[PDB]
């Protein structure tokens, strides 16, 4: 179920549903569904809502466990700073302006990689500045 098309057939397969059942429910043809399940074509977001509705799950729950492969895009923020922002428990009090300030920090193409490290930088910087 790691690939999206593999997950789609898994949902149908584990429920023991025939292609026509899912297709008639989703208002789409068996050949189109079959193409989606084989990965020949890529579903649109609207198609995912309908497929997820057929399986009585949310799109977010449908995409659970799905790896999208594809090309890789470098993150806008450093991973440690991004993870800190992503973590609700740690760095929640950090204002958006501070995230921008921290983002500019970088050393010689080398940056500290721990979310905890970025939190300490913020605390020390916030004490000195602001």
- Residue 114 as a binder of a second copy (CB under 8 A): the answer is no
Q: How many CA within 13 A on the CB side of residue 12?
A: 22
Q: Is 4 in the site for a second copy (CB under 8 A)?
A: yes
Q: Residue 86, interface with Li ion (CB under 5 A)?
A: no
If the CB atoms of residues 68 and 110 are measured against a second copy, the closer one turns out to be 68
Query: What, of a second copy, Li ion, none, does residue 41 touch, CB below 5 to 8 Å by kind?
Result: none
Secondary structure (DSSP) of 79-106: HHHHHHHH-SSSSTT--HHHHHHHHH--
> What is the distance between the terminal CA atoms of the chain, rounded to a whole angstrom?
49
When asked if residue 27 is in the footprint of Li ion (CB under 5 A), the reply is no
Nearer to Li ion by Cβ, of 60 and 110: the residue is: 60
Q: CB-based contacts of 45: which residues, under 8 Å, 6+ apart?
A: 59
> Which positions touch Li ion (CB under 5 A)?
8, 12, 29-30, 42, 44-46, 58-59, 68
């Amino acid at each position: 179920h790691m690939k999206l098309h593999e997950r789609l057939r898994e949902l149908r397969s584990e429920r023991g549903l025939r292609l026509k059942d899912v297709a008639e429910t989703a208002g789409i043809s068996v050949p189109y569904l079959s193409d989606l399940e084989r990965g020949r074509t890529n579903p649109s977001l609207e198609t995912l809502q309908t497929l997820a509705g057929a399986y009585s799950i949310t799109v977010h729950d449908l995409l659970e466990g799905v790896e999208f492969y594809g090309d890789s895009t470098e993150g806008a923020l450093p991973k440690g700073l991004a993870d800190l922002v992503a973590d609700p428990l740690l760095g929640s009090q950090i204002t958006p302006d501070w995230v921008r300030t921290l983002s500019r920090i970088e050393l010689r193409g080398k940056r500290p990689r721990d979310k905890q490290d970025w939190y300490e930088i913020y605390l020390h910087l916030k004490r000195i500045l602001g």
